[PDB]
Amino acid sequence: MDYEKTLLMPKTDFPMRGGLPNKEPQIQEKWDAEDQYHKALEKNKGNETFILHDGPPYANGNLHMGHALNKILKDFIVRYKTMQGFYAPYVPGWDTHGLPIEQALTKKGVDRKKMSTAEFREKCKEFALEQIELQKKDFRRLGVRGDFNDPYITLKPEYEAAQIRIFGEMADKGLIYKGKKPVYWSPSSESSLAEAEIEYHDKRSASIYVAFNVKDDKGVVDADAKFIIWTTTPWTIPSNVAITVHPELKYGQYNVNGEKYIIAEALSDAVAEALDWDKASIKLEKEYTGKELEWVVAQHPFLDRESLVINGDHVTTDAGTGCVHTAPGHGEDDYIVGQQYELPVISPIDDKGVFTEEGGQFEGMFYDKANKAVTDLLTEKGALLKLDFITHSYPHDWRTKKPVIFRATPQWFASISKVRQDILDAIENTNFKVNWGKTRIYNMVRDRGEWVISRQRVWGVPLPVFYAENGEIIMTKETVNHVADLFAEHGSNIWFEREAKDLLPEGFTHPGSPNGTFTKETDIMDVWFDSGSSHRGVLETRPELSFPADMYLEGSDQYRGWFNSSITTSVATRGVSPYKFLLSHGFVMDGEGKKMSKSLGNVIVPDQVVKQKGADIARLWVSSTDYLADVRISDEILKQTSDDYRKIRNTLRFMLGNINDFNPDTDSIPESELLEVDRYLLNRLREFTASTINNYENFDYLNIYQEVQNFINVELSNFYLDYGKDILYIEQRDSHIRRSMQTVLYQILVDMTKLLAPILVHTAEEVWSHTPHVKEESVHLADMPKVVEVDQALLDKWRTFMNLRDDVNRALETARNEKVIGKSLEAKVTIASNDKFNASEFLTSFDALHQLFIVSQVKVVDKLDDQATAYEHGDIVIEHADGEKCERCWNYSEDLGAVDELTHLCPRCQQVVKSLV
RNA sequence: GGGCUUGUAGCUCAGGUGGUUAGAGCGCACCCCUGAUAAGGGUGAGGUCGGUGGUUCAAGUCCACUCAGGCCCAC
Ligand SMILES: C/C(=C\C(=O)OCCCCCCCCC(=O)O)C[C@@H]1OC[C@H](C[C@@H]2O[C@H]2[C@@H](C)[C@H](C)O)[C@@H](O)[C@H]1O
Ligand SMILES: [K+]
Ligand SMILES: [Mg+2]
Ligand SMILES: [Mg+2]
Ligand SMILES: [Mg+2]
Ligand SMILES: [Mg+2]
Ligand SMILES: [Mg+2]
Ligand SMILES: [Mg+2]
Ligand SMILES: [Mg+2]
Ligand SMILES: [Mg+2]
Ligand SMILES: [Mg+2]
Ligand SMILES: [Mg+2]
Ligand SMILES: [Zn+2]
Ligand SMILES: [Zn+2]
Numbered sequence: 008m009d010y011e012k013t014l015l016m017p018k019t020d021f022p023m024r025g026g027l028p029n030k031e032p033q034i035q036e037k038w039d040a041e042d043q044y045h046k047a048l049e050k051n052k053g054n055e056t057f058i059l060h061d062g063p064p065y066a067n068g069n070l071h072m073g074h075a076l077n078k079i080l081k082d083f084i085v086r087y088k089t090m091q092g093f094y095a096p097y098v099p100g101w102d103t104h105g106l107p108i109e110q111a112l113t114k115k116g117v118d119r120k121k122m123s124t125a126e127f128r129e130k131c132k133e134f135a136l137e138q139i140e141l142q143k144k145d146f147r148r149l150g151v152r153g154d155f156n157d158p159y160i161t162l163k164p165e166y167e168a169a170q171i172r173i174f175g176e177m178a179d180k181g182l183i184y185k186g187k188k189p190v191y192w193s194p195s196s197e198s199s200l201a202e203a204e205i206e207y208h209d210k211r212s213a214s215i216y217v218a219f220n221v222k223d224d225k226g227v228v229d230a231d232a233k234f235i236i237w238t239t240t241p242w243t244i245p246s247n248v249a250i251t252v253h254p255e256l257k258y259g260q261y262n263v264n265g266e267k268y269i270i271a272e273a274l275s276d277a278v279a280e281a282l283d284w285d286k287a288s289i290k291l292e293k294e295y296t297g298k299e300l301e302w303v304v305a306q307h308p309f310l311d312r313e314s315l316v317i318n319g320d321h322v323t324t325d326a327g328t329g330c331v332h333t334a335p336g337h338g339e340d341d342y343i344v345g346q347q348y349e350l351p352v353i354s355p356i357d358d359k360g361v362f363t364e365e366g367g368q369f370e371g372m373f374y375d376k377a378n379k380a381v382t383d384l385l386t387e388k389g390a391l392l393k394l395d396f397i398t399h400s401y402p403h404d405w406r407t408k409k410p411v412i413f414r415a416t417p418q419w420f421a422s423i424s425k426v427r428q429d430i431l432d433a434i435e436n437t438n439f440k441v442n443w444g445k446t447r448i449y450n451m452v453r454d455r456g457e458w459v460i461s462r463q464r465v466w467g468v469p470l471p472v473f474y475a476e477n478g479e480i481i482m483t484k485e486t487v488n489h490v491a492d493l494f495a496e497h498g499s500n501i502w503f504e505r506e507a508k509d510l511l512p513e514g515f516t517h518p519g520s521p522n523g524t525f526t527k528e529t530d531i532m533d534v535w536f537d538s539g540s541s542h543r544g545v546l547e548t549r550p551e552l553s554f555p556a557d558m559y560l561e562g563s564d565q566y567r568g569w570f571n572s573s574i575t576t577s578v579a580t581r582g583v584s585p586y587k588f589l590l591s592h593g594f595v596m597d598g599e600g601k602k603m604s605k606s607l608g609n610v611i612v613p614d615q616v617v618k619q620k621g622a623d624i625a626r627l628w629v630s631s632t633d634y635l636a637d638v639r640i641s642d643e644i645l646k647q648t649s650d651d652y653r654k655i656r657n658t659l660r661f662m663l664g665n666i667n668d669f670n671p672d673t674d675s676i677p678e679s680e681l682l683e684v685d686r687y688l689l690n691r692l693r694e695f696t697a698s699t700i701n702n703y704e705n706f707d708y709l710n711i712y713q714e715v716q717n718f719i720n721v722e723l724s725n726f727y728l729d730y731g732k733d734i735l736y737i738e739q740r741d742s743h744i745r746r747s748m749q750t751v752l753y754q755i756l757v758d759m760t761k762l763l764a765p766i767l768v769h770t771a772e773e774v775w776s777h778t779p780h781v782k783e784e785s786v787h788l789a790d791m792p793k794v795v796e797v798d799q800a801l802l803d804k805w806r807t808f809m810n811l812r813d814d815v816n817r818a819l820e821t822a823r824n825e826k827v828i829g830k831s832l833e834a835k836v837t838i839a840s841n842d843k844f845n846a847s848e849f850l851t852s853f854d855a856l857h858q859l860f861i862v863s864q865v866k867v868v869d870k871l872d873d874q875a876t877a878y879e880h881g882d883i884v885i886e887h888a889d890g891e892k893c894e895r896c897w898n899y900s901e902d903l904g905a906v907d908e909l910t911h912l913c914p915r916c917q918q919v920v921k922s923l924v
Numbered sequence: 925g926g927g928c929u930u931g932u933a934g935c936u937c938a939g940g941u942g943g944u945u946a947g948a949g950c951g952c953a954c955c956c957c958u959g960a961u962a963a964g965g966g967u968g969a970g971g972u973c974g975g976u977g978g979u980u981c982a983a984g985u986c987c988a989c990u991c992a993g994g995c996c997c998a999c
Contacts, residue, residue, distance in 0.1 A: 011959060023963070322925070322998060340998085447928045451996085454927080563995045566928080593929085593994070600930075600993055633937075636930055637994050647935050650950065661960050713937060716949045729965060736959070820967045823956065830957055831965075861965080897959090 008908040010895045013920050014736050015745075017664025021777040023657060027621025031769045035147065038772075043787065044152050047089050048096055048551070050788055057093040059085055060546055060556035060586070061153075062569045063100035063161060063538050066135040067107050070145045072595040072603070072640060073562055075613040079629045080592060080708075081560055082151045086765035087703045090791045096551040099146065100159040100541060103135040104467040105534040106201055124465045124503045131466045132162055145614060150622045150768040152787070159545040161537045168495035169544035170537060171471050175487030176580040182422040185480065187352060188459060189335070189342050192414040194360035194374070195407040199416060199463055210401040210410060213379045214239040216282070217390040218268055218330075219307040223314050226304035229259070229295040232267045234305055235330040236390070239397070241378030244385070245365060246334025246353035247307050249345055253320040257297035258329075263289035265391075271297065271329035278328055283393065297329075307332075309385045310367070318344055337413040343456060352415055360412075374412060419470055419530060421458035426579050433574060433584040440590045440706060441635055448566045448574075448589075458575070460533050467531030469502040473511060474526035475519025485512060502527070539572025542585035554581070558588035565591065590706065592634040598641030611640055620649060623769045627652050630708040630766050651716060655767070658719045659774050661728055662756045665735050669749040671780050676747040683854065684730075685751045686798075687805045691722050692755050693797045699762050700794055708766070715763065723755075726809075733858050737896045739919050757781065758792040807880075808853065811846070814878035815860050821876075822885040832897055837866040837884040839875070846881030863888030863899040895920070 059081060064074060081097065088095045108131050113119070115134075119127045143155050159166060177183050191200045218235035221227065234250055258272040262279075264286055270278045279285065304314040315332065321340065323331055335342040336353030355362040360373040368384070369377040386392045402411040423430075430452045439445045461470060471490035473481040489512045493501050502510060507525040516523060547554045561569060570589065577585040596602060597609035604610070616625040628648045632638035678686065695718045702710045731748055738745040756778060764771040764786040775786040783789045815838070819831050828834045836856075840847040847869045850856060856865035875882035890901035893913035900913035906920045 014959065016959060023960080443928055447996090450927055454997095563929085567996050596994075598935090602994080628936095631936055633930095639936090641935095643935065647950065651936090654950085657960075657963070661964090664960070709937065713949070720949065725965075728960085732959080732964090816966060820955080823966075824954095828956090832957095 010909065013895065013909075013916075013923055015668075015738075015740055016736060017661060018667040019660065019664040019777055021660050021663050021774065023660055025621060025623070025652070025656060025770070027623055027769065028618055030773065031150070031622050032148075034769050034772050035150065038152070038785075038787075041785075043785065044154060047152065047788060048094060051089065051092050051094040054092050054094050056553065057085070057088040057095040058546070058553055058556045059095065059097060059558050059560065060542065060552075061097065061099050062559065062561045062565065063102040063159070063541060064142065065102045065105070065107070066138045066142070067111060068138070070142055070613050072611060072613055074142075074146070075149055075616075075625055076592060076595055076629055076632075076634065076638065077560070077562060078146055078151050079149055079626050080634060082149075082153075082768075083630070083708060083765050084558075084560070084706070086152065086768070086787065087791075090761070090765065090787075090789070092790060097153040098157075098159055098545065098549065098552070099143075099153045099155055100545060101135070101139050101142075101161065102534060102538050103132070103139075103160055103162040104531070104537055106203065106462070106464055106466070108135060109464060109466045110203065119465075125500060128465055128500060128503060135160075135162060148617050148622060149613065149625060159541070159549070161541075161544075162498070163544075164495055164498040165548055166541075166544035167468050167499045168491045169548055170468050170532070170540040171487060171491040171494055173540045173543050173576055173580055174471060174532070174536075175482075175484060175491065177421060177576075178482050178487065179484060180579065182425055182579055183419065183460075183482070184422065185417060185419055187415045188418045189338055189413040190416050190418075191402060191411050192358075192416070193404040193407065193409065193411050194356075194358070195404050195409040197358035199414075200404065200411060204405050205402050205411060206405040207400040208403045208408065209398050210403075212239045212397060212399065212401070213241060213383070214395050214397050215241065215383075215386060216328075216393045217244065217309070217386065218266075218392075219305065219309075219390055220266075221303065221305040223304040223306055225302065226314065228303060229300075230261065230267065230293070232259075232261055232269060234303075235268050235270075235328065236307075236332045237328045237330055238332065239399070240337070241382045242354075242374045243334055243337050244309060244382060245367075246336045247309075247311050247313055247315060248332075248334045248336075248350055248353055249315045249348075250305070250317045250333065251320050251323050251329075251331035252297050252300055252317045253323045254298040256324065257294070257299070259293070259295035259297065259300070260291045261293040261295065262291050267292075269295075269297075269329070271324065273324060274329040277326065308389055316348060318348065320344060336415050339413065342415070354415075356412075356414055375410075416463075418459050419461035419472075421460050421536075421575070421579075423452075423455050423458050423575065426575070427452060427455075429582065430574055430578045433578050433582075437584045437586065438588045440588075444566075444589060444591055448570055451566055451571060452575070455571075458533075460536055461530040462533055463529070464531055465503070467534065468499050468537060470528045470530050470532060472528035473507055474528070475517045476524065476526065477519035477521075479519075481517060481519075481525070486515075535568065535572040536576070538569050539576045541569075542573055542577050543580070546585065554585070555583065556586045558590055559586040560590045560592070563591055563593055593637035596637050596639045598639055598644060600637060600639055609641070611642075611645075616645065620645065621769070623767050624648050624652055626766055626768065627655075627712070631712040633709055651712075652767075652770075654724075655715065655719055655763070656770060658724050658728070659756070659760065659770075662723075662752055663774065663777055665731070666749050666753045666756060667779065668740065669746070669753055669779070671750075671753055674741070674746050674749065675753075676743065676750045680743070681747045681750065682744060683801075684805075684859065685747045687801055688722065688727055689751045689754065690797045690801055691718070692751070692758060693795050694802065695722075696758060696762060696792050697794045697797065700791060703765070711766070726812075730858060730861060733861070733896060733898070737916065737919065739922055761786055761789055761791060764789075804852075807849070808859075811844075811849070811880040812860060814880045815862075815883060817878070818876065818883040818885045819860075819862070827885065828887055830897075831861040832863055833888055833899065834862040835864045835866065835886050835888040836860060836862050837868055837871065837875070837886075839868045839871045839882050841877055841881040843877070844880040857898075863890075 085095045085097045112130055112134055117130055147155055191205055193200050216235060216237050218233050220233040221231055238244060259269040260275060261267040300317055302316055306314045333341045333345040334353050335345045335350055355364045356374060360375060361371055363370055369381050383394060403409060404411055431449060434445060434449050471487045473486060475481050490510060507527040510527060511525060546552045546556055559570060573585050613625065628645060695714065698714060699711055734745055734748055760771050760774045771786045775781055815836060819834055822828050838846050847867055850867045857863060871882040871884055875884040888899035890899045891903050893900050893903055893916055894911040895916040898913060902914055903911045904917050906912055906917050909920060912920060
């Protein structure tokens with residue numbers, strides 16, 4: 008007859024293959040339907056709280072692997088805290104203002120000039136919300152649990168109003184002020200431009216050398232040797248302002264003939280070389296320290312009146328002559344280092360290349376031809392020049408293809424310098440996972456210049472400022488807070504819909520404008536300000552949250568980004584960091600650790616990992632990366648992830664099928680009555696559990712990925728589950744020995760699925776769904792197993808038994824290569840003490856060595872002759888087992904018997920079978 | 925160029941105060957099993973630690989320089 012019918016084979020419909028791309032949507036569908044997000048919250052209703060504040064991704068485009076890495080790590084954290092009983096609301100957010108979106112619309116074919124600000128802004132909003140829906144869909148497909156149905160958005164009235172109140176408070180503490188800054192300006196478009204509207208094209212520029220003297224006397228500290236000058240911009244000459252000097256680097260030359268001017272060290276060679284001067288390459292003499300040449304007061308001719316100073320510099324040396332000269336009226340950093348000191352803003356020029364003030368003969372022409380021929384009047388006619396024509400790449404208006412120039416424009420600033428030390432101190436009191444995180448942002452805030460907070464665009468939050476003709480600036484608590492009031496109720500659009508007096512309080516009045524009339528600012532705030540105020544607009548505003556967030560977690564680029572604008576803004580108005588803990592991760596690279604491009608074809612997108620392999624696979628990958636640095640993804644990397652996932656899943660499947668008939672409520676064996684081998688695994692489970700919780704407490708998911716594998720592969724699959732077959736399949740269903748293993752098997756099943764739940768969200772649920780008798784619905788609404796003390800002596804004892812098992816297996820291998828044995832069951836193992844190990848005594852405290860080694864018989868003797876091979880754990884002798892093969896359990900027995908139609912059954916199996924019938 | 929950061933076996937990772945033949949899991953090779961079967965067991969082969977030079981009796985582990993990466997600036 009057939010023996011398999013009497014066997015107890017595993018039973019479960021839990022599939023070996025995941026089918027993730029088709030199973031996960033259903034599971035997600037159910038989680039939403041049963042509003043688990045809010046259920047998870049009410050489950051921990053009055054417990055300690057954990058607030059992880061989400062940084063708002065930009066509402067434009069497709070999520071990339073970075074969004075996935077970042078969101079999945081966040082979910083790990085909140086899920087684990089939730090599973091430890093913490094009330095941990097996770098509310099995603101979206102960054103919705105900014106130039107990029109205005110551009111998307113324009114590129115889409117919207118066209119501002121043809122509808123008005125109000126209609127264009129609504130178009131931006133409509134677009135942002137559409138993008139959000141798409142992104143929200145993708146985020147949820149990763150298995151992330153969060154308030155996705157009621158996320159915070161920077162375009163929401165309440166958020167905008169909060170942002171305004173932040174602007175108001177900073178303005179009150181005197182941290183907001185109006186000034187000016189140079190910006191790309193297109194005389195063609197009669198408007199300023201951002202780098203995104205700039206494209207380079209070669210241009211004909213007449214470069215000249217205007218060597219200017221060093222009169223006065225304050226600068227005659229070292230002779231009266233003139234200071235040369237070279238500008239590729241003749242119109243950038245009527246801007247008499249300082250010169251240059253890169254501290255440390257010195258040299259002055261002072262050479263024969265001419266006037267013994269000044270060049271430089273690494274410059275000299277490539278300086279006079281083109282100066283046409285080479286009257287016997289005359290040698291230098293009295294070089295006078297560059298760096299130290301500060302305040303070397305020098306009158307710069309051409310029709311000057313003021314002498315130009317010189318201060319520290321940042322980047323000057325190169326093919327470009329050592330003589331730079333400045334004029335904050337038309338220069339990027341030419342304005343920074345050139346302003347700290349009493350410096351008057353130079354040059355005019357209206358929205359058109361035309362100027363007026365200070366302009367001599369050229370009082371109404373342009374910045375071009377009015378130079379190359381006009382201003383070229385004032386040149387070598389006293390400053391020794393060399394009018395040359397050169398070609399180089401130059402900034403151009405991308406639509407008009409015409410040249411762009413720098414021009415100082417009124418801008419608004421946030422006074423970082425006044426709150427600097429305050430931010431530094433808040434950082435010092437901020438916790439970090441790694442010390443360099445603290446150092447990076449520290450030096451950041453330390454070397455940070457003033458914050459330009461204004462932009463001349465329409466898609467954003469308006470600076471709540473009003474102007475009173477007579478002078479200007481109306482920015483008081485009353486005015487800002489009333490604007491906040493309106494914004495809170497109508498949103499920012501109100502600003503573009505109403506007149507100034509409608510945006511002002513109760514029939515407001517001010518000394519300015521005796522006629523009760525007012526003007527309003529038009530600039531909007533920099534988007535960094537928008538997100539940077541998220542701690543106010545969401546943490547302080549929403550009921551479920553609390554201002555100081557337990558932590559912020561984002562990419563490395565946020566040290567200059569959201570981490571920075573958020574702390575700057577929070578310290579300014581609250582005096583504290585908006586985050587008690589700052590955790591950052593790296594970027595996602597390809598397999599070689601190189602940037603994903605597209606021209607290179609090494610991208611890999613989240614949407615594809617999910618569709619092709621599954622969200623649970625994208626997640627396991629995350630847990631396996633050392634996120635504190637850059638991480639790497641590729642097809643070979645993911646094939647690995649797939650292979651580990653299959654092993655975890657398959658192992659869980661086997662355990663599931665073998666506890667299908669186990670009812671914990673009535674079949675469990677007391678710990679004190681478990682077979683010792685079962686108590687050993689129960690303790691390996693406790694050890695693995697303790698270790699994993701610790702890892703979760705430290706955000707060390709990589710350690711869990713590593714340990715889970717070793718526990719699943721080595722302890723379970725390789726050993727316990729294998730050895731268990733001779734028990735689970737053969738013993739009587741309700742026998743003490745079978746129920747003892749099931750008792751531990753069940754606990755491991757349950758606990759391990761719970762311990763993995765934060766990571767393998769879908770599979771954990773699917774396994775939970777196939778486990779009999781689990782209390783709660785959903786693993787995700789259950790608590791982590793409690794950490795208990797392990798029996799260390801039991802562990803050491805079995806650790807040694809395991810190392811002894813390896814020697815046996817080695818002995819079994821040798822014998823198997825010799826065809827002496829096939830499966831380990833056809834073997835008889837004899838072992839005895841060695842000089843290296845007292846095997847005989849040690850093996851005395853173990854039961855059923857034959858089952859433990861998966862062999863038919865084990866004989867412990869005491870001593871073996873010089874036939875037995877020696878092992879680290881004793882001498883071992885392997886030979887084919889005695890007796891005949893029992894057709895049921897496949898162990899060899901010398902006492903096979905028949906039970907009715909079933910022959911060749913060992914005594915053990917005869918008993919099990921007889922109890923069937 | 926500046927701040928911070930990474931480089932150990934095919935892959936992902938371990939390797940306190942420097943000290944015998946650098947560890948793990950997977951993968952791979954070969955063998956066994958065929959009662960987890962688009963499964964399972966076993967053995968074994970692979971790194972000299974990005975490079976060079978030093979400190980030291982002795983360095984993956986300390987120093988210097990260097991190569992190739994990464995984020996953010998300077999640009
Ligand atoms: C880890 C990251 C990128 C990455 O890993 O790079 C992924 C690879 C890019 C894909 C390449 C495409 C081809 C392009 C080509 O051709 O070159 C960065 C992080 O991202 C996630 C989150 C985004 C939020 O909005 C940011 C917020 C906080 C602030 C308020 O704005 C944030 O945490 C951010 O710091
Ligand atoms: K088999
Ligand atoms: Mg680790
Ligand atoms: Mg294995
Ligand atoms: Mg390597
Ligand atoms: Mg490697
Ligand atoms: Mg590492
Ligand atoms: Mg191996
Ligand atoms: Mg080498
Ligand atoms: Mg050496
Ligand atoms: Mg020596
Ligand atoms: Mg060491
Ligand atoms: Zn061109
Ligand atoms: Zn039997």
